[PDB]
Structure formats: C-alpha cells, structure tokens
Ligand binder design. Structure first.
Ligand code: NI
Lengths: 137, 138
C-alpha cells in the first residue's frame, strides 16, 4: 500500500557530477524528501532520511500524501573531503519525481553526489574510457 | 570584439540511466538550444542553436561580451530515431544551467546531455553492478 523509495549518495570522486567506477559511497549522509500539492501549490509534508551501507537511503510514504510532486535534496555528508553540494548554475541539484507505483514495488531513484575538493588524478583516465571531453565549468 | 566558445557533448543514453556510461553512444548531428537571460527572471539576451559534429560534440559561439547571465542548454533534435526521446524528471525537461562570464579566445566544456533509447540493452544490468549501484527506475 505505501510507497517505498530507494536511493544512493556517492562522493563525486572526480567532480563529474555523475557516478563513475571511481566514485565512492557515503553512509550517514543527509537527505531531504519534500513534496508539494496542486490544489494549493503549497507544501504537504517533509521528511529527513539518512543513508546506511552503500549510501542507500530509504523512505516509506503513507498514501495520505498519494501522487504529489516530490523532489529530493542533499542535506549532510559524513565526510569532510566530500562536503560540497554541486550547484548547477544557480540552483541546488534537486531530483524531481512523482509519487506513483503499481504492485507496491519499490521505486529506486537516480543517485545524488557530493563534490570532492581535489579531483582524483586517475579521472582523466576515466573520462577517456567513456570517451568524453572532461567538463571544466 | 570577443569570441568565446562553450562546447558540450550529446550521447545516446543506451541504458536509460540519465547519465553517461561505458555503453553510451554519442549522437552526431544532434540539436542543442542555448538561451541566456538578464537574470533568473529577467529578459533573454539571446538564443542560439548548435548541432553536434563527431563524438556528439557541439561548439557554441559567443560573439559578444557577457557577464553573470543566466543561461541553460536544452535538447532539441536527434539524428537517430532509435534514440530520440528526451528524458523527463517527473515534470521538467532537463537542462544545463550555468552562469555566463565570458573570457576572450578560449573554450569551456560543460556536462553531456543524453537522449533515451527506447529499449535498454541486454547487459545494462551488468554496468550498474560494476558501479555498485541499484538499478534506477525513477
Ligand atoms: Ni503525512
């Protein structure tokens, strides 16, 4: 009946703002789940979740907040070399989704990463394996 | 006059992962729309369109001088109908938001944009496990 949402928090090891073979996971990371409504454009509820092993965070949504606009936001990191939240120009990197499932099956959300201060030196090797021009904005 | 170029890449998200993987494939001839703004809610300073050459790489021209302008790059067209779906994040179309402060005669590289291939490919589950991550379904 309820909604099970799963997600992971990685340390963006290479400052790629996505997840590579060099990325590492963060347990004890801060994550905010927030939802809005259509009839008001307003809030509906807010819950804070924390990541366990493999950076997995989990949250159970009762169906009183059924099918509403929801976005996730990074809050805290267990790790000071990876304490920076990468902004995309002028916005915090949200992770928008809408609250729906069938057969009650868990919905796994895309991951979110914290930026490291010093990019690893083996990163040019990684972007080269994915054959992309390394981002430097 | 100044001349400042910002280039990105367009890839076919073969695994429908909303990020680029070892089995992603770039799209040459894809379409990209750039648009800058006075501010977060100001008026647009301009809007240009570029297309991707080899390796899905597109080069955008900034003929002017611009500082602290609110720009974002959006997907426009694909040259491959096997990979033409633009992914949705629940209710917004994705974009590359950045603030423009040009410097003459140089190039800045931004993050890639992906088109969704309708059928994932048969060992995409194995790439997610290479990365130690649970396969997303959003
Ligand atoms: Ni409630």
């Amino acid at each position: 009946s309820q909604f099970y949402i799963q997600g992971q928090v990685y340390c963006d090891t290479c400052r790629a703002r996505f997840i590579t073979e060099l990325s590492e996971f963060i347990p004890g990371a801060g994550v905010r789940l927030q939802c809005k409504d259509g009839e008001n454009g307003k809030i509906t509820f807010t819950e804070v979740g924390y990541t366990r092993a493999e950076g997995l965070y989990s949250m159970l949504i009762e169906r009183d907040h059924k099918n509403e606009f929801c976005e996730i936001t990074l809050l805290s990191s267990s790790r000071k070399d990876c304490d920076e939240i990468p902004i995309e120009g002028w916005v915090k990197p949200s992770l928008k989704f809408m609250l729906n499932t069938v057969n009650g099956t868990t919905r796994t959300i895309n991951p979110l990463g914290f930026f490291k201060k010093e990019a690893l030196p083996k990163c040019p090797q990684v972007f080269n394996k994915l054959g992309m021009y390394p981002p430097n904005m």
